[PDB]
Amino acid sequence: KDIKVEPAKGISYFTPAQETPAGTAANPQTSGKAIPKLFQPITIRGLTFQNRLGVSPMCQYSAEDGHMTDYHLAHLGGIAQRGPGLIMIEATAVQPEGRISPQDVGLWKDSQIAPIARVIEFAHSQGQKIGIQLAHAGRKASTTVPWMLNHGSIATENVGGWPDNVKGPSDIPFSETFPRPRAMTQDDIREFKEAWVAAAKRALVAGADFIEIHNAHGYLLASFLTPYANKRTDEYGGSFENRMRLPLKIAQLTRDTVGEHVPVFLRLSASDWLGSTSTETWDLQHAVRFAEALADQGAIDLVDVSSGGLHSSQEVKSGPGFQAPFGIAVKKAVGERMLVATVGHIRDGKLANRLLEEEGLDVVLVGRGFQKDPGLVWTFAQHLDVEVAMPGQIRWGFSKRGTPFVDPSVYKP
Amino acid sequence: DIKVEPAKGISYFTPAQETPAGTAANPQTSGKAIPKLFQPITIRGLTFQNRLGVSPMCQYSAEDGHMTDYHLAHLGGIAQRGPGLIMIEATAVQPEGRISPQDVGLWKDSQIAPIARVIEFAHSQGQKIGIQLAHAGRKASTTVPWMLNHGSIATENVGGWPDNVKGPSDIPFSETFPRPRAMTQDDIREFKEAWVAAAKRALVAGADFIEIHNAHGYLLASFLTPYANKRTDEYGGSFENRMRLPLKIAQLTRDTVGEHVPVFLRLSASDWLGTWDLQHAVRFAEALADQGAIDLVDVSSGGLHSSQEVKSGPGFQAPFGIAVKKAVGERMLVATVGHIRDGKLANRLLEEEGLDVVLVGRGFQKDPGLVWTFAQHLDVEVAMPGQIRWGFSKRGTPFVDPSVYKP
Ligand SMILES: Cc1cc2nc3c(=O)[nH]c(=O)nc-3n(C[C@H](O)[C@H](O)[C@H](O)COP(=O)(O)O)c2cc1C
Ligand SMILES: Cc1cc2nc3c(=O)[nH]c(=O)nc-3n(C[C@H](O)[C@H](O)[C@H](O)COP(=O)(O)O)c2cc1C
């Protein structure tokens, strides 16, 4: 009668509200069929996710001095528009020299909050949840952007690199094309920990709903863990007991600065894909042990189980759900003390729901699949015959009345 | 020791895209010949990298004709995936010509920077984006399509103008639709004047082309449709009497735009009332190939009259354009739109039926990677932005192996 087009609430600008957020499955379900676990909500701390299909964090090598531009709104905003359970922002440097590339996002200054907040604000206008993977590239810092012919090389001070400011647990390079790391002094660690706390606060200011700690891909914290990159003879190296000291502090510190209401995640690498060797390697057993130590600690809410990037001589056997067995191995070890999410060439909805139902995991992350298909939530929903919400701008053409839910039978691939 | 170059001509930094997305490989690795779909088209001096384009789609997400951060996230991602051309939704030349109070507008000058920020991004990517200027005529002051009061009038309460609705006559669309006032000749004058001004600010926004909305029962269409255009004036009566305002706006648009700016015209080819029909359409279409002001005709259908009975279907309105192409030949280019959900149907529509451009609407809403998807349908290698293709590589080619990440 006089139904009005209501504005999304809390946003510096107008856009139509979405009353059911996109990616929310129909709870009654016209089919009468039950909603599969992939499209079942998850409440972690004071935060609920309409589904369990997340966008894994993905560096776009498109910021300037760590500042997001319009680009990232067009990038992330189109994906947030189509209803992913959660969006993770790319590795965001805590210190300038912890950037991977010179084009990385960073959050070591307050000028980098607004660029990110503008995107987090678009996600929020659509009713989505969005967060930030805090990172430090350790001995893999000051490299080249990876679509460049110079890819896999050192970023010189002429490209904006810092070849003489790469820091890590010890002074051993990752590769021969990679830079020479400088053993981090206690002054270094101290400031890194201060810088992590500083960056997390700016993230909450930007409007992140959760924080993920990047302790993976041989970047740092991960390098502290792997014995062959950390030959320190102090309390931060030596035993496995010691090599975890710093990761466990950052976990504690992140939880401290966000409080009790903000989910905290941790990404780790489960194996270094190093073939039979008699020396100490980062194998699944090590990962599960670290994961166990984290559940003892109580800080983290979820472990994000990736692999690789740890050692230059890896031999990763990529394939569909190839690193799903790692995350299973971790959930059997921690059970319901922590949640785990998996990632890695998860390409259809069946595999996704199965890794959550049969194999008993909590959250499925996709990366490349969203880059090629920003509507994967709709695609996966179609794989499992699930009716899911899509925003009004997008659904009304794929209709027949006034439900916020799309029939999985329409525009079937 | 290479450098990552910024894009050119843009406010902000963004990695530059040497080979635009949607650009096939001139020497296709497979040796297979580039299908027409992925063959470039040049209108005036403008060159499109493929014949797959984003059809104009309204988003009912604007405030005072102003675009927001939404349209950047909406068209942005779609554009990043290399659509040959991207058309901005119907931009109203007059406030009362808006379909809804949430339509994008170009009747003032504060409505340019909004529309230009998105064009700027498209340009940063190497893509060609244009704008469809329009007037809703008797179908204006209506509600958004996803709202329960869909197919109804927007009162001043919602921000509508149920009284300032101006069309070719007081003939309303339906009991649900608003009551329109027949426009005075001074009204038509003001309208034509508004169009020129709107096109002018569009060129200031960065438009690479302009499409005329002469379809869907809006003013220009309402004038060509006898059941709504009976003014007894030089505009009312003879088919020629009704074709004037349309043909005038065509020339006027060609006049305001230069000779290097392509100008398209979208028309409805039937009212599905079987009365405007493929015949009336082919006639008006030839009148356009005569005037020589329009470079491309966007053949569509529907919206002309309530009580219409559209028969939707894969390529349901392709025949309409094949007929227009028949009576126009190389005199004008023709574009088809309508449930084209795969590349094979699209390419065929181009090669086996001679048509020039394939336009997709909803396919892009569901899949802003449609071009990538149509590419795999025809085993075509296309460029994708360096930010997207690097992970899908086994390494320096801007093109993606259509075999990687296939359904
Ligand atoms: C382009 C690109 C950027 C990425 N950026 C990050 C990142 O910033 N932080 C991180 O932990 N992983 C990053 N990843 C790793 C992926 O997020 C994730 O582990 C996933 O495996 C990548 O591909 P997938 O869809 O097959 O799972 C990135 C991957 C790609 C392809
Ligand atoms: C959400 C939406 C918005 C649209 N906006 C416009 C428009 O602004 N101008 C126009 O001429 N047609 C518009 N259309 C019609 C389409 O652009 C076009 O006629 C056709 O539907 C696209 O073909 P396809 O959707 O079957 O791929 C719109 C259609 C939809 C679903």
Numbering used by the authors:
A (entry chain C): 2 to 401, 405 to 416, 422
B (entry chain B): 3 to 276, 282 to 401, 405 to 417
Give the exact sentences the study uses for this entry:
We have identified and produced four new putative ERs from the filamentous fungi Aspergillus niger CBS 513.88 and Botryotinia fuckeliana B05.10. On the other hand, AnOYE8 and BfOYE4 share most of the typical conserved residues reported in Class III OYEs (S23, P24, C26, A60, Q102, R215, S249, Q265, G284, M285, F305, G307, R308, and R312; YqjM numbering).
AnOYE8 was solved and refined in the C121 space group with four molecules per asymmetric unit. The overall structure of a single subunit showed the typical conserved α8/β8-TIM barrel fold. In agreement with the general behavior of Class III OYEs, the four molecules within the asymmetric unit assembled into dimers with the functional quaternary architecture peculiar of these enzymes. AnOYE8 is an elongated dimer composed of two protomers with an interacting surface of 2807 Å2 (data obtained by EMBL-EBI-PISA analysis). Both the α1-helix and loop 3 (capping subdomain), as well as the peculiar long N-terminal and C-terminal loops of each protomer, were involved in the dimerization surface, which contained 71 interfacing residues that established 18 hydrogen bonds and 8 salt bridges. The C-terminus of each subunit (from Gly393 to Lys416) protruded through an “amino acid finger” (Trp397) that reached the active site of the adjacent subunit, shaping the entrance and the catalytic cavity of each subunit. AnOYE8 accommodated a non-covalently bound FMN cofactor molecule lying at the bottom of the active site pocket. Similar to other Class III OYEs, AnOYE8 contained the highly conserved proton donor Tyr220 and the histidine pair (His215 and His218) involved in the binding and proper orientation of the substrate through hydrogen bonding with the electron-withdrawing group of the substrate. The omit electronic density map revealed the presence of a small organic molecule, most likely SO4 anion, present within the crystallization precipitant agents, lying on top of the isoalloxazine ring of FMN.
